[PDB]
């Protein structure tokens, strides 16, 4: 792409500089260039790729929700007609967000997932695939919506099945996967009971394994466990 001429190491070094400068669109472009070099990603590199895109897409999602709320209000009885501009601009933001999701899903399909053999890489990428189909599902209203939801479910389920077999119940990737799959159940699949059961069981199985951990691993795991508790508190 436009990053075709830059060394892989220089793309990684610039992604880290962009992160320090809070320039997340640049960070994501540098990391997309690094992926497109064709080599597998190390754990540090996979987390640079995730950090970059989650911040880009998170700006688009928060903007989309502001716009959608405005558009819904314009559709209430007694609202003055203001023309097509709110729908057009929500659509503009929606299309760009879909495009970011398609770009991430494209990197995973070409060819991050197929070369990822170890559990920590394979589960991380499948969680990513679930997360970006979930962001597509958040905006979907069409004939497509069930299949987008199903794609998110299927990716999360394959990541859950590997993580349960190959990772300890305290592993931060296994914990974050379960936190996000639980959010998928609650907010996307209309299954709040499955969301609460998943968050509860995940929290309790990690609590029972904390004893095996070093002080630093303990802090990594308990951080994610508190997110699961925050959602159980919100939902119960």
């Amino acid at each position: 792409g436009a990053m075709g001429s830059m060394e892989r190491a220089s793309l990684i070094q610039k992604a880290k500089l962009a992160e320090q400068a809070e320039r997340y669109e640049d960070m994501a472009a540098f990391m997309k260039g690094a992926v497109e070099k064709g080599e597998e990603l190390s754990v540090e590199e996979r987390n640079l790729l995730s950090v970059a895109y989650k911040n880009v897409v998170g700006g688009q999602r928060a903007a989309w929700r502001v716009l959608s709320s405005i558009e819904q209000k314009s559709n209430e009885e007694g609202s003055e007609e203001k023309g097509p501009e709110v729908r057009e601009y929500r659509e503009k933001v929606e299309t760009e967000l879909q495009g970011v999701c398609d770009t991430v899903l494209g990197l995973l399909d070409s060819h991050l997932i197929k070369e990822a053999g170890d559990a920590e890489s394979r589960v991380f990428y499948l969680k990513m695939k679930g997360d970006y189909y979930r962001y597509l599902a958040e905006v979907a209203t069409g004939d497509d919506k069930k299949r987008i939801i199903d794609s998110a479910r299927s990716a999360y389920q394959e990541a859950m099945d590997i993580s349960k077999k190959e990772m300890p119940p305290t592993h931060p990737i296994r914990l974050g996967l379960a936190l996000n799959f639980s959010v998928f159940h609650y907010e996307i699949a209309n299954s709040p009971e499955e969301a609460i059961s998943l968050a509860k069981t995940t929290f309790d199985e990690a609590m029972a394994d904390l004893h095996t951990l070093s002080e630093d691993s303990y802090k990594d795991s308990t951080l994610i466990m508190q997110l699961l508790r925050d959602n159980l508190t919100l939902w119960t």
Binding site: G176, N180, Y186, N231, L234
Partner: peptide, 6 residues
Amino acid sequence: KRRKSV
């Protein structure tokens, strides 16, 4: 106030 994801 918003549910957590990571």
